[PDB]
Amino acid sequence: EITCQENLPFTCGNTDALNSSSFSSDFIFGVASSAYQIEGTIGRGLNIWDGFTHRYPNKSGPDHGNGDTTCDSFSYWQKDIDVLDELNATGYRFSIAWSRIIPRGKRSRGVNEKGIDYYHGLISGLIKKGITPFVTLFHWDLPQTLQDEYEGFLDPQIIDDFKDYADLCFEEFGDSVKYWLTINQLYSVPTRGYGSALDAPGRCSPTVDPSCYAGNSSTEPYIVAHHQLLAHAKVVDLYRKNYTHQGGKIGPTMITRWFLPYNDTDRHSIAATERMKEFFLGWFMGPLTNGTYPQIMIDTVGERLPSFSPEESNLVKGSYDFLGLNYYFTQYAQPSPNPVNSTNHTAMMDAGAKLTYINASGHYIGPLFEKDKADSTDNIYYYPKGIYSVMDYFKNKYYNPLIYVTENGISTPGDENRNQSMLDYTRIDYLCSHLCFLNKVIKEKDVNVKGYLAWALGDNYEFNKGFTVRFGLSYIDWNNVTDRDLKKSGQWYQTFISP
Amino acid sequence: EITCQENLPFTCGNTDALNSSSFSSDFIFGVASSAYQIEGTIGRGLNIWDGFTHRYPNKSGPDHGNGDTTCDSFSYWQKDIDVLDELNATGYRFSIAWSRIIPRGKRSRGVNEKGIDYYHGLISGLIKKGITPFVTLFHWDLPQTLQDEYEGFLDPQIIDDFKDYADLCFEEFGDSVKYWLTINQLYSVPTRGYGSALDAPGRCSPTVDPSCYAGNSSTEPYIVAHHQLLAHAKVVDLYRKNYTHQGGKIGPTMITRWFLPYNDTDRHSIAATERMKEFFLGWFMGPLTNGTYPQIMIDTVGERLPSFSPEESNLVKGSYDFLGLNYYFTQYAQPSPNPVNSTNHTAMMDAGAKLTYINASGHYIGPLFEKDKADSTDNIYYYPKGIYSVMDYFKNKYYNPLIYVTENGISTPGDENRNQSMLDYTRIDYLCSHLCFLNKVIKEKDVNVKGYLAWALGDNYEFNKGFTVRFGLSYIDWNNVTDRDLKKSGQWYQTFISP
Ligand SMILES: *[C@@H]1O[C@H](CO)[C@@H](O[C@@H]2O[C@H](CO)[C@@H](O[C@@H]3O[C@H](CO[C@H]4O[C@H](CO)[C@@H](O)[C@H](O)[C@@H]4O)[C@@H](O)[C@H](O[C@H]4O[C@H](CO)[C@@H](O)[C@H](O)[C@@H]4O)[C@@H]3O[C@@H]3OC[C@@H](O)[C@H](O)[C@H]3O)[C@H](O)[C@H]2NC(C)=O)[C@H](O[C@@H]2O[C@@H](C)[C@@H](O)[C@@H](O)[C@@H]2O)[C@H]1NC(C)=O
Numbered sequence: 001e002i003t004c005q006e007n008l009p010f011t012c013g014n015t016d017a018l019n020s021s022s023f024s025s026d027f028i029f030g031v032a033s034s035a036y037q038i039e040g041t042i043g044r045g046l047n048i049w050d051g052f053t054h055r056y057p058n059k060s061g062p063d064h065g066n067g068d069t070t071c072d073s074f075s076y077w078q079k080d081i082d083v084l085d086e087l088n089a090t091g092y093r094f095s096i097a098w099s100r101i102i103p104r105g106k107r108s109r110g111v112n113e114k115g116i117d118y119y120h121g122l123i124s125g126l127i128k129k130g131i132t133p134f135v136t137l138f139h140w141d142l143p144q145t146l147q148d149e150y151e152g153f154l155d156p157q158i159i160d161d162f163k164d165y166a167d168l169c170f171e172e173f174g175d176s177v178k179y180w181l182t183i184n185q186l187y188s189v190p191t192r193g194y195g196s197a198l199d200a201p202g203r204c205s206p207t208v209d210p211s212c213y214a215g216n217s218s219t220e221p222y223i224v225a226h227h228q229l230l231a232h233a234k235v236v237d238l239y240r241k242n243y244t245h246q247g248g249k250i251g252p253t254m255i256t257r258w259f260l261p262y263n264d265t266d267r268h269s270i271a272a273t274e275r276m277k278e279f280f281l282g283w284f285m286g287p288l289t290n291g292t293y294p295q296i297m298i299d300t301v302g303e304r305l306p307s308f309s310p311e312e313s314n315l316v317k318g319s320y321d322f323l324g325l326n327y328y329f330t331q332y333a334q335p336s337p338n339p340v341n342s343t344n345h346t347a348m349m350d351a352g353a354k355l356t357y358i359n360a361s362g363h364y365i366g367p368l369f370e371k372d373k374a375d376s377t378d379n380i381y382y383y384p385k386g387i388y389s390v391m392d393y394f395k396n397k398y399y400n401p402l403i404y405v406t407e408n409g410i411s412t413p414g415d416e417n418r419n420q421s422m423l424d425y426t427r428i429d430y431l432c433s434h435l436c437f438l439n440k441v442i443k444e445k446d447v448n449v450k451g452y453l454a455w456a457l458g459d460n461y462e463f464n465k466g467f468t469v470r471f472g473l474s475y476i477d478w479n480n481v482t483d484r485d486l487k488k489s490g491q492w493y494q495t496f497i498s499p
Numbered sequence: 500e501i502t503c504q505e506n507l508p509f510t511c512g513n514t515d516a517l518n519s520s521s522f523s524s525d526f527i528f529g530v531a532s533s534a535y536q537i538e539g540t541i542g543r544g545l546n547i548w549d550g551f552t553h554r555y556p557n558k559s560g561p562d563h564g565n566g567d568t569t570c571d572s573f574s575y576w577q578k579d580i581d582v583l584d585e586l587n588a589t590g591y592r593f594s595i596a597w598s599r600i601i602p603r604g605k606r607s608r609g610v611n612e613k614g615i616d617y618y619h620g621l622i623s624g625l626i627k628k629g630i631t632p633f634v635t636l637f638h639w640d641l642p643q644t645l646q647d648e649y650e651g652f653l654d655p656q657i658i659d660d661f662k663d664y665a666d667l668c669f670e671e672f673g674d675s676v677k678y679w680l681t682i683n684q685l686y687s688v689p690t691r692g693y694g695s696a697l698d699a700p701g702r703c704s705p706t707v708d709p710s711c712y713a714g715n716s717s718t719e720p721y722i723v724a725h726h727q728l729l730a731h732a733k734v735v736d737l738y739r740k741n742y743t744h745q746g747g748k749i750g751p752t753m754i755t756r757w758f759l760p761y762n763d764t765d766r767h768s769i770a771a772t773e774r775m776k777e778f779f780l781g782w783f784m785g786p787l788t789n790g791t792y793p794q795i796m797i798d799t800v801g802e803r804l805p806s807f808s809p810e811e812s813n814l815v816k817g818s819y820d821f822l823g824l825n826y827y828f829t830q831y832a833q834p835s836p837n838p839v840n841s842t843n844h845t846a847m848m849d850a851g852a853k854l855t856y857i858n859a860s861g862h863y864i865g866p867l868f869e870k871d872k873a874d875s876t877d878n879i880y881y882y883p884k885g886i887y888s889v890m891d892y893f894k895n896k897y898y899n900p901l902i903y904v905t906e907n908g909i910s911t912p913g914d915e916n917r918n919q920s921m922l923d924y925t926r927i928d929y930l931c932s933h934l935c936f937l938n939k940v941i942k943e944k945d946v947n948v949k950g951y952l953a954w955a956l957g958d959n960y961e962f963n964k965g966f967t968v969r970f971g972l973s974y975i976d977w978n979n980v981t982d983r984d985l986k987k988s989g990q991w992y993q994t995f996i997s998p
């Protein structure tokens with residue numbers, strides 16, 4: 001019988017008690033990255049994260065940081081491989097920058113051979129060290145040209161441009177890459193990119209944020225989400241019809257959270273909690289498992305919710321071999337009004353829920369996850385049991401899928417000096433406590449989880465935060481980015497992997 | 500009788516001997532800037548100078564600098580006005596960033612109202628201080644979307660997108676702006692952007708520079724130059740047909756140089772010198788004055804030189820009310836082979852000339868202009884008489900045009916400390932020696948020159964050089980960009996203007 005801790009102090013950093021041998025022999029352990037966050041702009045065209053961070057520097061991070069140079073994995077990809085080799089990792093998730101291989105967006109405009117060569121060399125280097133690549137086609141970095149031609153995922157033109165990009169990736173890299181992710185965190189671009197305008201491309205209703213160049217936060221999230229699902233599904237169909245000889249697997253990436261009632265004896269909070277599951281997870285998992293959006297979304301969102309045709313429904317339903325599930329934290333849910341006629345209405349209001357990290361009796365859900373220095377009542381707290389609850393829910397609700405945990409990690413402040421930054425015991429605690437619950441759910445609930453990739457390989461540009469936080473298991477000096485030095489967490493993870 | 504110095508030491512920094520009163524009462528004196536170089540990316544979309552500097556950081560400058568934040572004239576435009584007011588300047592040349600007012604490139608995709616407001620406030624502030632705006636529509640910063648959709652000026656689609664952009668500018672700003680420049684330095688994008696790939700977008704033949712993503716240095720410069728002329732001419736026709744009520748004037752910007760024979764008794768060097776005038780100046784001025792390219796270009800370039808239809812010829816011929824002439828330096832010319840079958844052939848080779856700053860007897864043409872620390876035999880030297888020779892030539896060869904000198908200036912090294920940087924006596928010498936010759940040519944040759952704008956108002960991002968050189972008449976601290984402090988040159992220029 002497995003017992004796992006939910007509160008500080010944690011004792012799962014002892015590899016005598018928790019290590020890779022606790023999991024099945026074939027289980028993959030590694031780390032993750034994304035292209036905007038690590039590569040730099042050298043050698044690629046411009047994408048909407050370049051555009052957004054440059055047009056709206058205060059939205060890029062408090063330091064106005066961006067991905068222009070970052071950790072320079074364009075130059076230092078071998079050093080990334082070296083970290084993975086030091087870890088004895090068996091997996092690495094990275095993304096392909098669309099703008100590096102097709103700078104002009106549309107494949108018929110030509111490819112960048114040198115960009116293709118960059119990923120060939122990375123892939124070959126990984127495989128030579130026994131590391132399985134997990135490759136994200138689209139980690140938010142849409143070529144700027146496509147956003148300017150037709151507003152990107154706002155328009156159905158995205159589907160064929162994404163398909164042709166993906167086809168090039170399968171053609172060039174699929175002989176070696178056997179695990180593909182289509183779109184990173186399906187929920188995020190619709191809501192943050194087109195709802196709150198916290199993320200690229202930065203569209204919203206005028207009264208939500210007067211700096212947005214255009215948008216409608218009530219309608220566009222739904223349009224974009226719908227196009228994401230269709231573009232994803234078209235790529236999965238292309239993969240499974242035209243690249244079956246490659247013997248690989250493909251799936252989407254979800255951001256997952258668990259949700260608990262703010263007041264577990266209040267029917268209204270219980271209802272809000274179940275609505276959140278539907279609106280947060282079901283928005284995408286309903287289509288992916290059934291070809292339809294959840295009924296509560298149909299009912300609430302009404303004419304703002306697009307319909308799938310019968311052909312589209314069939315294309316989207318079942319459009320995965322596995323799910324990449326990202327998991328960071330859990331929220332309490334309580335009811336909230338949905339003012340659909342307000343000029344500041346957002347899609348996110350349609351769930352009719354307010355989310356907190358403290359429940360009605362004043363209980364904080366778990367240890368600190370992210371401090372918010374401008375408003376401490378907005379601090380985020382984590383909840384290790386949430387990974388158990390999410391995986392159990394996916395198994396039970398969503399037809400026992402094959403799952404890889406494609407991100408899980410925690411930040412430390414960029415204000416810490418290097419010695420403090422390397423002494424990242426809070427990261428060991430977060431990672432181990434989640435791994436304990438992941439082992440527990442696999443054993444107790446028989447969830448088909450076959451790997452775990454911690455966020456992040458190394459310090460990088462963090463969307464929305466610049467270089468003001470660090471997520472890496474290895475440390476990068478922003479004054480001299482060449483080295484990636486394993487932190488205490490990376491050293492712990494090395495021991496966990498090879499105990 | 501006016502006597503002007505050609506060699507150090509110069510004594511024209513004495514405003515007792517040379518000042519604004521030496522020129523006609525109406526003559527405009529000011530300074531110049533461009534949008535990529537000064538504004539920053541905040542509040543605008545991405546353009547090909549963002550793309551180029553980010554994809555090819557070693558081509559942005561030795562420091563890998565770029566226009567992301569620069570002097571932040573987005574925030575500090577009032578401080579630019581303040582410099583101009585301190586100078587008692589009567590003119591200011593600035594550019595509109597296309598990506599700030601139409602981030603999606605094509606006008607039908609929507610405009611950025613806040614971008615429009617930015618230029619309205621600048622323009623209104625200038626006029627309130629008695630400063631005449633000279634506004635460049637296109638200072639190289641093409642929206643990235645257009646380059647990615649159709650490769651920008653490589654394709655005739657540029658013409659209508661440029662026209663619709665210009666129409667928006669005339670509509671929004673032409674009630675106040677009475678001097679418009681279409682395209683900055685017509686020669687530069689074809690040759691550097693599409694020939695040598697030193698400049699955005701960075702296209703060339705594969706053996707010219709293997710880093711180029713695509714291109715053909717032998718053909719594309721000509722295509723791009725042809726489209727520039729057509730796009731320019733379509734905008735001038737639009738202006739003069741639809742905006743005549745505004746009572747303003749429009750013209751192109753030329754980069755001018757003079758050319759002297761490397762050996763003034765050698766017929767081959769004399770011939771190369773005359774070819775250079777045709778290939779450098781006539782490439783554009785032939786079309787602008789006659790609707791045809793120079794015969795030597797027709798003959799040499801052959802099938803690589805596009806033809807104008809009779810309608811196009813008529814549109815381009817006479818498509819200016821004035822010329823903005825930029826002038827920095829003069830070169831000696833000697834013959835050079837034109838290897839049209841070589842895989843590394845460039846359009847620039849078609850002139851059949853090699854350019855130097857030292858003549859056959861070892862004479863350097865004038866004082867140092869720009870030191871090249873990697874190769875000192877590649878140092879640039881200036882030649883004050885060249886402004887006289889250029890203006891005389893334009894009057895005689897090109898039908899006595901109205902001229903404004905739209906740039907003239909010199910750099911100092913970014914390695915200098917602030918006190919050295921503010922003690923910019925080399926800049927006084929360059930500016931005064933050229934102003935002396937400009938007065939001389941107006942008086943002696945009756946060239947219709949009606950203003951002079953020195954490059955640059957303040958230190959900025961220099962194309963190709965990052966922040967490794969400074970051109971400003973006012974100093975900017977890159978650690979805190981708010982202030983623009985007049986250098987010795989700016990203080991001199993203040994006295995020259997109001998002696
Ligand atoms: C998994 O996918 C299944 C589909 O493959 C989902 O089942 C569908 O659920 C639909 C409701 O979401 C349901 O459709 C309703 O059908 C009513 C019956 O119509 C038939 O008989 C009519 C009925 O009197 C007639 O007009 C129709 O022409 C048919 O003959 C119908 O009125 C409904 O329309 C009203 O409600 C929708 C909102 O739900 C409004 O958008 C619409 O304007 C109208 O106001 C609805 O019809 C659907 O209307 C929209 C139109 O685009 C669709 O094509 C039309 O179908 C449908 O019958 C079933 N299909 C079957 C095969 O069962 C299933 O939903 C879950 O299970 C069903 C039983 C129900 O409990 C749902 O609430 C659950 O979500 C999906 N499962 C999951 C887990 O999501």
Ligand SMILES: *[C@@H]1O[C@H](CO)[C@@H](O[C@@H]2O[C@H](CO)[C@@H](O[C@@H]3O[C@H](CO[C@H]4O[C@H](CO)[C@@H](O)[C@H](O)[C@@H]4O)[C@@H](O)[C@H](O[C@H]4O[C@H](CO)[C@@H](O)[C@H](O)[C@@H]4O)[C@@H]3O[C@@H]3OC[C@@H](O)[C@H](O)[C@H]3O)[C@H](O)[C@H]2NC(C)=O)[C@H](O[C@@H]2O[C@@H](C)[C@@H](O)[C@@H](O)[C@@H]2O)[C@H]1NC(C)=O
Nearest residue numbers: 785786788789790791792793794795797798801806807812
């Ligand atoms: C200012 O613009 C003026 C035009 O408005 C320029 O004058 C034109 O100069 C053209 C040469 O560049 C000249 O065209 C040549 O015409 C030859 C005569 O053709 C007529 O009689 C024929 C002759 O036997 C017959 O086939 C034609 O159908 C006509 O009836 C002719 O062969 C020439 O073609 C050969 O040379 C061109 C290269 O120059 C090759 O491209 C072509 O394949 C061929 O090998 C040339 O014809 C032009 O051919 C190209 C085609 O696209 C053009 O439409 C065709 O016209 C033309 O006659 C005159 N036009 C007039 C009205 O004078 C003027 O040029 C300068 O002055 C002229 C006198 C000459 O000295 C030029 O070298 C100078 O540049 C321009 N001025 C300046 C300063 O540039």
Ligand SMILES: *[C@@H]1O[C@H](CO)[C@@H](O[C@@H]2O[C@H](CO)[C@@H](O[C@@H]3O[C@H](CO)[C@@H](O)[C@H](O)[C@@H]3O[C@@H]3OC[C@@H](O)[C@H](O)[C@H]3O)[C@H](O)[C@H]2NC(C)=O)[C@H](O[C@@H]2O[C@@H](C)[C@@H](O)[C@@H](O)[C@@H]2O)[C@H]1NC(C)=O
Nearest residue numbers: 261262263264265266267268269270334359360361362363
């Ligand atoms: C978790 O949710 C539960 C369920 O909602 C909360 O308990 C409910 O709390 C209500 C007060 O917020 C209680 O109603 C009140 O009852 C007193 C005594 O009769 C009365 O004077 C009030 O006016 C009020 O009555 C309601 O007024 C509004 C009418 O529309 C409605 O019909 C009336 O019910 C309610 O009885 C209680 N329900 C239960 C089943 O206990 C619970 O609140 C926490 O516990 C209750 C017992 C009370 O001590 C609250 O102070 C305390 O906050 C909530 N838990 C937390 C931690 O918020």
Ligand SMILES: *[C@@H]1O[C@H](CO)[C@@H](O[C@@H]2O[C@H](CO)[C@@H](O[C@@H]3O[C@H](CO)[C@@H](O)[C@H](O)[C@@H]3O[C@@H]3OC[C@@H](O)[C@H](O)[C@H]3O)[C@H](O)[C@H]2NC(C)=O)[C@H](O[C@@H]2O[C@@H](C)[C@@H](O)[C@@H](O)[C@@H]2O)[C@H]1NC(C)=O
Nearest residue numbers: 760761762763764765766767768769833858859860861862
């Ligand atoms: C400025 O250009 C002028 C004109 O080209 C240069 O003068 C010419 O310089 C040529 C040498 O580069 C002289 O030709 C040579 O004459 C000597 C004496 O006969 C002879 O032994 C050589 O072989 C050579 O003759 C040529 O060989 C190649 C044959 O195809 C050709 O037919 C022969 O001419 C040439 O006479 C001279 N022309 C004139 C009109 O003087 C001039 O060069 C400079 O001055 C000359 C006089 C000489 O002192 C050169 O050393 C010196 O460089 C050049 N000025 C500069 C500074 O480069």
Ligand SMILES: *[C@@H]1O[C@H](CO)[C@@H](O[C@@H]2O[C@H](CO)[C@@H](O)[C@H](O)[C@H]2NC(C)=O)[C@H](O)[C@H]1NC(C)=O
Nearest residue numbers: 205206207215216217218219303304340343344
């Ligand atoms: C978001 O787009 C929706 C749909 O176009 C706009 O909502 C509508 O508003 C028009 C004008 O009021 C209404 O007549 C419709 O009844 C509404 N339709 C629905 C589906 O709600 C909403 O004004 C736009 N919001 C913003 C801020 O522009």
Ligand SMILES: *[C@@H]1O[C@H](CO)[C@@H](O[C@@H]2O[C@H](CO)[C@@H](O)[C@H](O)[C@H]2NC(C)=O)[C@H](O)[C@H]1NC(C)=O
Nearest residue numbers: 261262263264265266358359360361362363364
């Ligand atoms: C807030 O969260 C706390 C902690 O999960 C809940 O408290 C638990 O309540 C259960 C059922 O009453 C008790 O058995 C436990 O002993 C309590 N745990 C502790 C740490 O207090 C609490 O019920 C939640 N409040 C609401 C209103 O939902």
Ligand SMILES: *[C@@H]1O[C@H](CO)[C@@H](O[C@@H]2O[C@H](CO)[C@@H](O)[C@H](O)[C@H]2NC(C)=O)[C@H](O)[C@H]1NC(C)=O
Nearest residue numbers: 704705706714715716717718802803839842843
């Ligand atoms: C530049 O484009 C020119 C024109 O397409 C290419 O030049 C031609 O080369 C083809 C193949 O040799 C030739 O048959 C033609 O005779 C040439 N045409 C002319 C007008 O010169 C040139 O190969 C291309 N250069 C590069 C590096 O791709």
Ligand SMILES: *[C@@H]1O[C@H](CO)[C@@H](O[C@@H]2O[C@H](CO)[C@@H](O)[C@H](O)[C@H]2NC(C)=O)[C@H](O)[C@H]1NC(C)=O
Nearest residue numbers: 760761762763764765857858859860861862863
């Ligand atoms: C190189 O440039 C120098 C300077 O312009 C030329 O020298 C002048 O030559 C003229 C005509 O012979 C003499 O009258 C001057 O006195 C010379 N000036 C000085 C400063 O020497 C020289 O002729 C040029 N060389 C060539 C080969 O063209």
Ligand SMILES: *[C@@H]1O[C@H](CO)[C@@H](O)[C@H](O)[C@H]1NC(C)=O
Nearest residue numbers: 015016017018019021022499
């Ligand atoms: C691995 O952890 C298991 C408990 O899951 C433990 O029994 C085993 O001895 C540990 N391995 C090492 C080498 O410490």
Ligand SMILES: *[C@@H]1O[C@H](CO)[C@@H](O)[C@H](O)[C@H]1NC(C)=O
Nearest residue numbers: 055056057058210211541542
């Ligand atoms: C940040 O930038 C936007 C312009 O993009 C401006 O609207 C907003 O006021 C600025 N935010 C703060 C908090 O200053």
Ligand SMILES: *[C@@H]1O[C@H](CO)[C@@H](O)[C@H](O)[C@H]1NC(C)=O
Nearest residue numbers: 163234235237238239241242
């Ligand atoms: C598959 O490849 C063939 C060859 O390009 C193409 O005809 C077919 O449409 C593609 N298939 C998809 C997505 O099924």
Ligand SMILES: *[C@@H]1O[C@H](CO)[C@@H](O)[C@H](O)[C@H]1NC(C)=O
Nearest residue numbers: 207208339342343344345346
């Ligand atoms: C607009 O929304 C903000 C945040 O969503 C809220 O605090 C404010 O009350 C809203 N105003 C109206 C008019 O509803």
Ligand SMILES: *[C@@H]1O[C@H](CO)[C@@H](O)[C@H](O)[C@H]1NC(C)=O
Nearest residue numbers: 477479480481482483484485
């Ligand atoms: C930068 O870091 C690398 C790796 O530690 C080191 O070899 C190189 O010398 C350092 N550069 C400077 C300028 O210190």
Ligand SMILES: *[C@@H]1O[C@H](CO)[C@@H](O)[C@H](O)[C@H]1NC(C)=O
Nearest residue numbers: 020087088089494497498499
């Ligand atoms: C790498 O992991 C394999 C598999 O568990 C193990 O056999 C090998 O010893 C490990 N190597 C190192 C250096 O830890």
Ligand SMILES: *[C@@H]1O[C@H](CO)[C@@H](O)[C@H](O)[C@H]1NC(C)=O
Nearest residue numbers: 514515516517518520521998
């Ligand atoms: C201006 O320069 C002229 C010579 O061009 C001179 O005569 C005049 O006195 C100077 N003005 C002043 C105020 O020094």
Ligand SMILES: *[C@@H]1O[C@H](CO)[C@@H](O)[C@H](O)[C@H]1NC(C)=O
Nearest residue numbers: 042043554555556557709710
């Ligand atoms: C600069 O960058 C390019 C890649 O864009 C590379 O091809 C070239 O070798 C580098 N230049 C130098 C001098 O290192």
Ligand SMILES: *[C@@H]1O[C@H](CO)[C@@H](O)[C@H](O)[C@H]1NC(C)=O
Nearest residue numbers: 662733734736737738740741
């Ligand atoms: C002028 O404006 C009118 C109204 O848009 C348009 O019909 C006409 O084509 C434009 N003219 C140009 C470039 O001449």
